[PDB]
Amino acid sequence: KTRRAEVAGGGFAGLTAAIALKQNGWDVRLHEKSSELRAFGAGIYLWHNGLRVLEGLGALDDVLQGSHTPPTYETWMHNKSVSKETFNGLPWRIMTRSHLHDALVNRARALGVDISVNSEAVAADPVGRLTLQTGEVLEADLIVGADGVGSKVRDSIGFKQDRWVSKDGLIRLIVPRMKKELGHGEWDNTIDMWNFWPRVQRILYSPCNENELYLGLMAPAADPRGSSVPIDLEVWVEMFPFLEPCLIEAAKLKTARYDKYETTKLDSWTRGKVALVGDAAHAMCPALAQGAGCAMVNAFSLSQDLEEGSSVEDALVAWETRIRPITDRCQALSGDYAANRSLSKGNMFTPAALEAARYDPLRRVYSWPQ
Amino acid sequence: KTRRAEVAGGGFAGLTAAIALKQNGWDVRLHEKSSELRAFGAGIYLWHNGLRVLEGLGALDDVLQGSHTPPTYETWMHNKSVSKETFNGLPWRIMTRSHLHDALVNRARALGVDISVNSEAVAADPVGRLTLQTGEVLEADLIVGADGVGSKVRDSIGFKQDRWVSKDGLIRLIVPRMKKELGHGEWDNTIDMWNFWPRVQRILYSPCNENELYLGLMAPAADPRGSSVPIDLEVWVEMFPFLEPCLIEAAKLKTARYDKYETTKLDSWTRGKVALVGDAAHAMCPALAQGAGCAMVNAFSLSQDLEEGSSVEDALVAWETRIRPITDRCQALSGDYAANRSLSKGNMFTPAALEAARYDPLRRVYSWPQ
Amino acid sequence: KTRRAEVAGGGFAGLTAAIALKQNGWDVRLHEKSSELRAFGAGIYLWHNGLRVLEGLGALDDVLQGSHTPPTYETWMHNKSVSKETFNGLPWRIMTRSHLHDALVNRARALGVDISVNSEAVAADPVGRLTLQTGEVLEADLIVGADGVGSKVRDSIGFKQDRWVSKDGLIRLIVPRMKKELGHGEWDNTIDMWNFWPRVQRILYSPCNENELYLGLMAPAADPRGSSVPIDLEVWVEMFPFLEPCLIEAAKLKTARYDKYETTKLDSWTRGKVALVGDAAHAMCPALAQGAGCAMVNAFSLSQDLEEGSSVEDALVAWETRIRPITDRCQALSGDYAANRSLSKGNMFTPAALEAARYDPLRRVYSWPQ
Amino acid sequence: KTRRAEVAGGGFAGLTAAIALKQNGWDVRLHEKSSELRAFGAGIYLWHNGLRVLEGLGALDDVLQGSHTPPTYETWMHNKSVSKETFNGLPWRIMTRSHLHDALVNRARALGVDISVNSEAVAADPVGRLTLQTGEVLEADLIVGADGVGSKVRDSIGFKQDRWVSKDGLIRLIVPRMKKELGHGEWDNTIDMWNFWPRVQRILYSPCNENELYLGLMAPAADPRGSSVPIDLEVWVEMFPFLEPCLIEAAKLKTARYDKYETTKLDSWTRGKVALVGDAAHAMCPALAQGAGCAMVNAFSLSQDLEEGSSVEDALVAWETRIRPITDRCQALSGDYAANRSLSKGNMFTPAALEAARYDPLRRVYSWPQ
Ligand SMILES: Cc1cc2nc3c(=O)[nH]c(=O)nc-3n(C[C@H](O)[C@H](O)[C@H](O)COP(=O)(O)OP(=O)(O)OC[C@H]3O[C@@H](n4cnc5c(N)ncnc54)[C@H](O)[C@@H]3O)c2cc1C
Ligand SMILES: Cc1cc2nc3c(=O)[nH]c(=O)nc-3n(C[C@H](O)[C@H](O)[C@H](O)COP(=O)(O)OP(=O)(O)OC[C@H]3O[C@@H](n4cnc5c(N)ncnc54)[C@H](O)[C@@H]3O)c2cc1C
Ligand SMILES: Cc1cc2nc3c(=O)[nH]c(=O)nc-3n(C[C@H](O)[C@H](O)[C@H](O)COP(=O)(O)OP(=O)(O)OC[C@H]3O[C@@H](n4cnc5c(N)ncnc54)[C@H](O)[C@@H]3O)c2cc1C
Ligand SMILES: Cc1cc2nc3c(=O)[nH]c(=O)nc-3n(C[C@H](O)[C@H](O)[C@H](O)COP(=O)(O)OP(=O)(O)OC[C@H]3O[C@@H](n4cnc5c(N)ncnc54)[C@H](O)[C@@H]3O)c2cc1C
Ligand SMILES: O=C(O)c1cncc(O)c1
Ligand SMILES: O=C(O)c1cncc(O)c1
Ligand SMILES: O=C(O)c1cncc(O)c1
Ligand SMILES: O=C(O)c1cncc(O)c1
């Protein structure tokens, strides 16, 4: 009578699914392809929606400890402050990726989720069979494809899809705060520092805690200096001289990567006993900082629909119908914002922009009205 | 088998108790002495702790709609900004008293709490008897004394106590925002505007929403002009000229009162089947903006302890033991702050100051670390 | 024994020459080609050097009354303040062109300078003969060619020269201050408001007094909207929205012109009894705001050299040798600044930039050290 | 035929008189009581009027080199900026006392003024006799009493007078700028930093040049800590913490003095061939920073009246009649400002306040209109 779930992928989506299912009495095993449990991307923003998932997962405490809510989300254009936004009290948080990942892994382990590394799902069958690269075939009542933009759970089954990999991208790093060295200013703020002149270069400045600063350095791929790794210190200091202390530390990082944006959209997220969650289903532009938020809401919501006494197949259909439109709208709006460079104007966290963030997955209503 | 509760007082404490008990299946009747259900005091701050009570009461949505979280809590001394505090993301909110009261009344009514007006508790018996001014004697399994600083539930039984009524006080009003007329500034902020020179006059500036502004005008009773009602417009405009548009509206209010501060502390909060909650038990100085927050946490916590399968008498003892120290510490610290004028320095919402605010009554842990 | 001077041109150079010579006992007649005595160009800056000429001319009082020294000379790039300069106390002043012109005309009249309008010099002879368009031939001991960039005194004689008329230019206007309507800011400042993005548009904001504001609206000739007269209100408000009240008034002016920059440089400024002064000799780019300053210093200096007991011919040679290098350097540096857009960086009023301004023609030394 | 002048006192008044007379062909001897030529008081402000005297004395160049005009004269009350004043371009300057004194001494020496030290005037006779402490009796056509508030030239003759020495005063010091250590701010400004709460303490912050800062630390004599010398570092840092780097240097100065304010007013300034100039005649409160300015204007004006071909006795009478009302008005207004603490309000350099500053002694008119 113990339902069995097999989860492919140990990112935020897979860990969320695994914890949520285990809390509801599922026998859960999670399979991570990589040799270690790790999260790439340097830093990450969560909002009310994702923080509520964490509360629902019993992992909120560990996350809030050692992460940061800036006093304001500030936008600059050509070094002129154009907006300061606080979202009418809507909760939000910045943290390192490792911080969020560790909290989730620790919670999954505390609950007794069986986690395997070097364990890649290479095929999934809608009847409830997952095949690993080792040739092991696992039977389950539920298969969760949380295996990222390149999901083999998805592609082994075949889902009609549009995927896009941009030519442009950015360099994401964690460096020391160097707060004193930054001198006068509001250095606890998020500051999105846009420029189009004299060149297209932007830094998203994102404090994670008293020690760690998350920087995103964005320049076009066609710019050989701005897109260089390790960073071309001179061209960054030239346009962001007020960040020189931090940029000097950034230039030391030989692990720096220029990572490209990538999106996925599918005609459906389910097939029989298989559900696709996270980037496997709905990778999106990061303008609204909701890729993981939506992934986590969707994973948590999946566990909710599986508590209705329905067949797994029916629960999965109900789940997508219920929760997908929030994600579709957020993905579309984030892509629109990215293409139009809407964030450069400031004051763009409108009620519509904040729809996903306002959703409370625990009570299934929208909170924090704007 | 339906447990019966009789609640004396229709303030925030009594309404919270009534809703929380009704949600847990108690047959609840609430008795308000006044001819109408009303809340005095103009405006009010709630923090995470109180907002979590509201969530637990199913009244959070109605409260957040039409209330305000300032971008920052700012302090001025002699018109110089000395601090801006955002509490590392700790949720907080400002609203009119009527806004909070209405949300609670509407929720109690929706749940079918029996509410009587012109119904004053004049005596309570620890065996579970409440006598109204009408001579009606009501039997119950639980009596809640939520009847304010002058609690007759408390005083009919006899509780060792120290009460204090200050000679000093303040004038609290709601006026239009007049935001455009205030011109350049950060007029969505809370701004605590202190002065000792040329006279002791202070205004706590507290936006409630896009339409309503809560002002507290504080001057010593020995100052015949600053303590006058309706307000002596000239002496307020002289020291707060930047608020003239709002003060002109304030001066129109012939309902204005100079209300005195009042505190209560008791050796215990329980006797048999009687529990004292709110100002009946623990009225405190308003420096930490936690009088109602603690009252609401205590009322909600009472309902929790009554779900343990214990006798009512034992549950009440357990309740006070569990929850009272948070209130004792907050009351003491708020009184210390008031006497030392500590808030005038700015940056005084320390981790210790925020202890009560950080408490989450739903999960019974402290959240939002500083 | 009364030396006779004939001056061609009633601009700042010619009026300065006429007053200075008349003060020294010359019989002076001045000939203005136009039907009225008028000054075009809306507004003008003078510095210490030009203010000292005015003192020497007995016209300083009338100029300082009704003109303005801003508290600072401020530069913006893309709406971000990049510098505020006060030149270590070096005197400077902004005024309407008419204000300066009127003061000079009134002083010349008070001294009994004979002024003719509709009186154009069409030929000059180094032996001391000036021919007017009327055919009148005037004999004099000194002929002053103060007849502008298109000087016929110069060109009738033949001076080796390089002249340049730019394709680009600007629209100069006087509008009401609208100070209250501009709201919060430092609206008594000079503010040089540069932009390259989203288009090349710049406004030099120059208060003249409590009533009048001098604006220079600069856009490339290749921009059909930004270079349009009367002004294309929308494209100016878009990039300078904080000046909308003033720009609305500017758009009413059907007299607005897009005037082109023009320079002149000559191998010499003298021939026999003929001296060329002002734009006739040394028109320059306006970056250092010294075209008229140098013109006035040169005209005044001419009068000084004529007091040495030398022949007029020798005095003129001595004059150019003594005073020309200040002008040559200023012209070259202003042209360099214009071409490199150096002023866009702010903090460019260096000691070298301010050399002409620092010169005191009365004492013949440099003052106001930097 | 060479007129002989004997000047008592080598302060700013006596040096000005000596230079001005020597320039006009007087045989001038100056007698300084002290063993060295020195100026006490740390720093000093001059305005247009005094700068024009310096121009008239041929000492302006040496003064402007190595002195400072702040970008603005700023006033703070309780650390809040209440005004920024630039006087519509009216020239002004801050310098060390030694800087001004040296320039004057060097000019007097260059002109061949005979200067004696350890040479005290102890008696003067209206017939033109000056007696030194050595017993030497000097005959002259003019005797100038420029010997300070305690003038023996004045008191040996007997002038009806009111003198006042205040109980209160201030500590004036020169310290290093420590500009970098002061961090963010407008540290080239004059800043008059007033406080009445928590104690009456004020600092006038006055940069003299890139190296030297003039500070005036003002507290009541009844305050044993604030009036202490060497300075009580703690009580100054407490109320001016932003000046700590400079105050630490100030506390090292064991030469610091708490000097009292002193005023003098006389029924007349002349007797026969004797003229009283400077503090000997008109010491005043320093609120308008015009004590030396008026002293210098008066000394220079004296030389002017002596060029009219009148008897010395008549010239002196004409001089006082012509020039004294400017000083009487300035003295009265400065005393009014001091007593009413008017400067604490900011924006008090009104046209009337600036009357003395606006006077141009060279042309004998008022300039720099407000
Ligand atoms: C630049 C940038 C900035 C962003 N910023 C934010 C932000 O601020 N806030 C936010 O909420 N989101 C943000 N996002 C989006 C966020 O990174 C993703 O949406 C999120 O990490 C998706 O998580 P996931 O678990 O679906 O996928 P992934 O994080 O890709 O994790 C899947 C895990 O899949 C494992 N794996 C892959 N294939 C297999 C397999 N076949 N079998 C087993 N394991 C497999 C992968 O190795 C890995 O361990 C940002 C994205 C980008 C690109
Ligand atoms: C100036 C000031 C500012 C404050 N600001 C804040 C703030 O910002 N945030 C915050 O959390 N707290 C604040 N407080 C404290 C807050 O006002 C109180 O702690 C709170 O209202 C107490 O609620 P209560 O229900 O216990 O009592 P009450 O609000 O006094 O309500 C009891 C209700 O008792 C009814 N009643 C009385 N006697 C009887 C009886 N015998 N029988 C039946 N009914 C009876 C009373 O009429 C009334 O309807 C502030 C207090 C003051 C004085
Ligand atoms: C955009 C711009 C901004 C500027 N801003 C400043 C500034 O802020 N400060 C500054 O000092 N300078 C400034 N200048 C330069 C300043 O305008 C000139 O250098 C100055 O006006 C030259 O004066 P002028 O007397 O030599 O010539 P003009 O002003 O040209 O005057 C000559 C006079 O010549 C009369 N005339 C012409 N031909 C004859 C003839 N044949 N016979 C008789 N009369 C004749 C002309 O009609 C006229 O009345 C600026 C210039 C430009 C273009
Ligand atoms: C706190 C303070 C701040 C001030 N700030 C300013 C300011 O910013 N700007 C400004 O313009 N003014 C200022 N003043 C006023 C200024 O200090 C005086 O007005 C000025 O120094 C007066 O100069 P004096 O030459 O008349 O007298 P003094 O400076 O007193 O000089 C007279 C000289 O007299 C010599 N002496 C005295 N007796 C004899 C004698 N019997 N025989 C020979 N020699 C004699 C004295 O030793 C000395 O060398 C300030 C004054 C004070 C108190
Ligand atoms: O626009 C972005 O690339 C972006 C990336 N991360 C967070 C965010 O709010 C925006
Ligand atoms: O100090 C107060 O009186 C006070 C009153 N209300 C809220 C608060 O934070 C402080
Ligand atoms: O750069 C200019 O065009 C310019 C024009 N007028 C004054 C000035 O300082 C600069
Ligand atoms: O008020 C003063 O003591 C004062 C002292 N020096 C200059 C000044 O402007 C004011």
Partner C contacted by A79 (CB < 8 A): yes
Q: How far is C329 from chain A (nearest CA, A)?
A: 30
3-state secondary structure string, D188-221? CCEEEEECCCCCCCEEEEEECCCCEEEEEEEECC
Distance from residue C301's CA to the centre of ligand 3 (Å): 18
- Residues in CB range of B182: below 8 A, 6 or more apart: B242, B243, B245, B246
- Residues in CB range of C207: below 8 A, 6 or more apart: C68, C70, C94, C177, C187, C188, C189, C190, C213, C214
**For residues B53 and B276, what is the distance between their CA atoms, to the nearest angstrom?**
18
The torsion of the CA quartet C75, C78, C82, C84, rounded to 10 degrees, works out to 30
Residue of D71, D88, D365 lying closest to C72 (CB–CB)? D71
Distance from residue B246's CA to the centre of ligand 6 (Å): 20
Token duo for residue B305: 């302890």
- Residues in CB range of C293: below 8 A, 6 or more apart: C46, C47, C49, C50, C53, C356, C357
Contact list, A184 vs chain D (CB under 8 Å)? 183-184
Half-sphere exposure of A332 (CA within 13 A, CB side): 9
Closest residue, chain B, to D79 (C-alpha)? B80
C359 alpha carbon, distance to own chain's centre: 16
**For residues C260 and C150, what is the distance between their CA atoms, to the nearest angstrom?**
14
In this chain, the answer to whether the domains covering A1-39+97-166+262-370 and A40-96+167-261 adopt an identical fold is no
**For residues B14 and A219, what is the distance between their CA atoms, to the nearest angstrom?**
59
**For residues C81 and C143, what is the distance between their CA atoms, to the nearest angstrom?**
48
Say if CB A322 and CB A305 are below 8 A apart: yes
Which ligand is nearest to the Cα of residue A339, counting in written order? 5
The CATH number fitting domain C40-96+167-261, selected from 3.40.50.1110, 3.30.420.40, 3.40.50.2300, 3.30.9.10 = 3.30.9.10
Distance from residue C179's CA to the centre of ligand 3 (Å): 30
Three-state DSSP class for residue A165: strand
Q: Which of D296, D34, D26 is nearest to D143 (CA)?
A: D26
The order of strands in the sheet holding A129-132 is A121-125, A129-132, A137-139
Distance from residue B287's CA to the centre of ligand 6 (Å): 4
Contact A77/C78, CB-based, under 8 Å? Answer: yes
Q: Which of D340, D326, D7 is nearest to D143 (CA)?
A: D7
Per-residue CA distances from A146 to A35, A263, B307 (Å): 17, 15, 40
Token duo for residue D336: 């009014």
Contact A64/B368, CB-based, under 8 Å? Answer: yes
Q: Tokens 């303490």 sit at which residue?
A: D201
Beta-strand runs (E) in C120-181 = 121-125, 129-132, 137-139, 142-145, 161-176
Contact list, C77 vs chain A (CB under 8 Å)? 78
A206 membership: H or E segment, kind and range: strand A202-207
Peptide bond into D241 cis (omega under 30): no
- B75 DSSP β-pair partners: B83, B192
**For residues C147 and A242, what is the distance between their CA atoms, to the nearest angstrom?**
51
Name residue A149's amino acid.
V
Task: For chain C, give the number of residues.
Answer: 370
Nearest-atom index, ligand 6, CA of B338: 1
Say if CB B174 and CB B212 are below 8 A apart: yes
- D253 DSSP β-pair partners: none
Partner B contacted by A69 (CB < 8 A): yes
Name residue B162's amino acid.
D
User: CA D199, D200, D206: angle at the middle one, nearest 5?
Assistant: 125
Q: Which of C163, C353, C160, C136 is nearest to C271 (CA)?
A: C160
Partner A contacted by B88 (CB < 8 A): yes
Q: Is D224 exposed, middle or buried (0-12, 13-18, 19+ CB in 10 A)?
A: exposed
The protein residue with its alpha carbon nearest to ligand 6, atom 7, reads B289
B246 membership: H or E segment, kind and range: helix B244-250
A57 — phi, psi (to 5°)? -90, -5
Please give the span between the terminal C-alpha atoms of chain D, in angstroms, as a whole number. Answer: 46
**D368 secondary structure, DSSP code:** S
- Which residue among C38, C163, C172, C279 has the greatest number of ligand 3 atoms within 8 angstroms of its CB, and so is best to mutate? C279
Closest residue, chain D, to A181 (C-alpha)? D183
State the Rg of chain A over Cα: 20
Per-residue CA distances from D324 to D305, D306, D352 (Å): 13, 16, 16
DSSP for A258-276? EEEEEEEEES-SEETTEEE
D132 — phi, psi (to 5°)? -90, 165
Contact list, A183 vs chain D (CB under 8 Å)? 183-184
Peptide bond into D224 cis (omega under 30): no
Look at the domain C1-39+97-166+262-370 and name its fold.
FAD/NAD(P)-binding domain (3.50.50)
Say if CB B104 and CB B13 are below 8 A apart: no
Q: Is D44 exposed, middle or buried (0-12, 13-18, 19+ CB in 10 A)?
A: buried
Q: Tokens 């008119």 sit at which residue?
A: D365
**For residues D2 and C141, what is the distance between their CA atoms, to the nearest angstrom?**
42
DSSP for A45-78? EEEHHHHHHHHHHT-HHHHHTT-B--S-EEEEET
- Residues in CB range of B340: below 8 A, 6 or more apart: none
Preceding-residue numbers of gaps in chain A (C–N over 2.5 Å): none
Token duo for residue C335: 């042209």
Q: Is D342 exposed, middle or buried (0-12, 13-18, 19+ CB in 10 A)?
A: middle
B234 — phi, psi (to 5°)? -55, -45
Contact D86/C93, CB-based, under 8 Å? Answer: no
Token duo for residue A191: 């500051």
Q: Other CB atoms closer than 10 Å to residue D265's CB: what's the count?
A: 18
Q: Which of B98, B91, B346, B368 is nearest to B209 (CA)?
A: B98
Token duo for residue D67: 């002195």
Q: Which of D337, D322, D206 is nearest to D284 (CA)?
A: D337
D123 — phi, psi (to 5°)? -145, 145
Contact C89/D91, CB-based, under 8 Å? Answer: yes
Nearest-atom index, ligand 3, CA of C149: 30
Name residue B304's amino acid.
Q
Name residue D160's amino acid.
K
Name residue A222's amino acid.
A
**CB burial readout B64-78, b (16+ within 10 A) else e:** bebbbbbbbbbbbbb
**For residues B320 and B267, what is the distance between their CA atoms, to the nearest angstrom?**
11
A249 alpha carbon, distance to own chain's centre: 25
**For residues C208 and C174, what is the distance between their CA atoms, to the nearest angstrom?**
9
Q: How far is A183 from chain D (nearest CA, A)?
A: 8
Task: For chain B, give the number of residues.
Answer: 370
C198 — phi, psi (to 5°)? -75, -15
Per-residue CA distances from D257 to C113, D35, D42, D102, D170 (Å): 61, 20, 11, 22, 8
Query: Measured on CA atoms in the order B321, B323, B326, B332, is the torsion positive or negative?
Result: negative
- Residues in CB range of D260: below 8 A, 6 or more apart: D165, D166, D167, D168, D169, D221
**For residues D298 and D266, what is the distance between their CA atoms, to the nearest angstrom?**
15
Partner D contacted by B78 (CB < 8 A): yes
Chains with 3 or more CB pairs under 8 A to chain D: A, B, C
Q: Is C48 exposed, middle or buried (0-12, 13-18, 19+ CB in 10 A)?
A: buried
**For residues D218 and D201, what is the distance between their CA atoms, to the nearest angstrom?**
6
Say if CB A275 and CB A14 are below 8 A apart: no
**B86 secondary structure, DSSP code:** -
Contact list, B183 vs chain C (CB under 8 Å)? 183-184
B80 membership: H or E segment, kind and range: strand B80-85
Token duo for residue D114: 């005979």
- Residues in CB range of D135: below 8 A, 6 or more apart: none
Chains with 3 or more CB pairs under 8 A to chain B: A, C, D
Half-sphere exposure of D188 (CA within 13 A, CB side): 15
Q: Is A70 exposed, middle or buried (0-12, 13-18, 19+ CB in 10 A)?
A: buried
Q: Which of C336, C337, C357, C362 is nearest to C294 (CA)?
A: C357
**For residues A96 and A45, what is the distance between their CA atoms, to the nearest angstrom?**
9
Distance from residue B282's CA to the centre of ligand 6 (Å): 17
Say if CB D51 and CB D91 are below 8 A apart: yes
Q: Other CB atoms closer than 10 Å to residue B262's CB: what's the count?
A: 17
**C68 secondary structure, DSSP code:** B
**C126 secondary structure, DSSP code:** T
**For residues C162 and C262, what is the distance between their CA atoms, to the nearest angstrom?**
11
Say if CB A86 and CB A73 are below 8 A apart: yes
Contact list, C198 vs chain A (CB under 8 Å)? 196
User: CA C193, C197, C203: angle at the middle one, nearest 5?
Assistant: 20
Q: Other CB atoms closer than 10 Å to residue C262's CB: what's the count?
A: 17
**For residues B51 and B64, what is the distance between their CA atoms, to the nearest angstrom?**
9
Token duo for residue A172: 């994401």
**For residues B132 and B116, what is the distance between their CA atoms, to the nearest angstrom?**
11
**For residues A346 and D178, what is the distance between their CA atoms, to the nearest angstrom?**
39
**For residues D370 and D364, what is the distance between their CA atoms, to the nearest angstrom?**
18
Method used to determine the 3D structure: X-ray
**For residues A55 and D278, what is the distance between their CA atoms, to the nearest angstrom?**
80
Peptide bond into C198 cis (omega under 30): yes
Say if CB C51 and CB C109 are below 8 A apart: no
3-state secondary structure string, B92-157? EEEEEHHHHHHHHHHHHHHHCCEEECCCCEEEEECCCEEEECCCCEEECCEEEECCCCCCHHHHHH
Say if CB C179 and CB C43 are below 8 A apart: no
Partner B contacted by D341 (CB < 8 A): no
Q: In this complex, how many residue pairs, one in chain A and one in chain C, have their CB atoms less than 8 Å apart? A: 17
C43 membership: H or E segment, kind and range: strand C43-47
Ligand 1 contact via A44 beta carbon (within 6 Å): yes
Q: Which of C89, C148, C155 is nearest to C280 (CA)?
A: C148
How do A129-132 and A121-125 pair as beta strands? antiparallel
Ligand 7 contact via C239 beta carbon (within 6 Å): no
Partner B contacted by A68 (CB < 8 A): yes
**For residues B344 and B202, what is the distance between their CA atoms, to the nearest angstrom?**
10
C66 — phi, psi (to 5°)? 85, 15
Closest residue, chain C, to D208 (C-alpha)? C88
Ligand 4 contact via D16 beta carbon (within 6 Å): no
Q: Tokens 């696709």 sit at which residue?
A: A276
Which ligand is nearest to the Cα of residue A14, counting in written order? 1
Say if CB D299 and CB D52 are below 8 A apart: no
Token duo for residue D23: 């320039």
Domain-wise residue ranges, chain C? 1-39+97-166+262-370, 40-96+167-261
Say if CB B170 and CB B216 are below 8 A apart: yes
D334 alpha carbon, distance to own chain's centre: 13
Partner C contacted by D91 (CB < 8 A): yes
Q: Is B150 exposed, middle or buried (0-12, 13-18, 19+ CB in 10 A)?
A: middle
**For residues B269 and B275, what is the distance between their CA atoms, to the nearest angstrom?**
6
Ligand 7 contact via C289 beta carbon (within 6 Å): yes
Q: Which of B22, B25, B18, B21 is nearest to B1 (CA)?
A: B25
Say if CB B12 and CB B104 are below 8 A apart: yes
Q: Is C158 exposed, middle or buried (0-12, 13-18, 19+ CB in 10 A)?
A: exposed
The order of strands in the sheet holding D212-219 is D80-85, D73-77, D190-194, D202-207, D212-219, D161-176, D258-266
Note which residues in 177-196 of chain B have CB less than 8 A from chain C.
183-184
The H-assigned helical ranges of chain D are 12-23, 48-57, 60-64, 97-111, 152-157, 233-239, 244-250, 279-282, 291-305, 312-340, 355-358
Contact list, D60 vs chain C (CB under 8 Å)? 367
**For residues A361 and C45, what is the distance between their CA atoms, to the nearest angstrom?**
65
Distance from residue D130's CA to the centre of ligand 3 (Å): 61
How do C43-47 and C27-31 pair as beta strands? unpaired
DSSP for C70-125? -S-EEEEETTEEEEEE-GGG--EEEEEHHHHHHHHHHHHHHHT-EEESS--EEEEE
Query: Measured on CA atoms in the order C12, C17, C22, C23, is the torsion positive or negative?
Result: positive
Q: How far is A345 from chain B (nearest CA, A)?
A: 20
Token duo for residue D118: 């350890």
Ligand 2 contact via B43 beta carbon (within 6 Å): no
Choosing among C74, C75, C78, which should be mutated to test the A contact, i.e. which has the most A CBs within 10 A? Answer: C78
**For residues B363 and D225, what is the distance between their CA atoms, to the nearest angstrom?**
55
Contact list, D89 vs chain C (CB under 8 Å)? 64, 68-69, 91-93
Q: Which of B143, B175, B174 is nearest to B271 (CA)?
A: B143
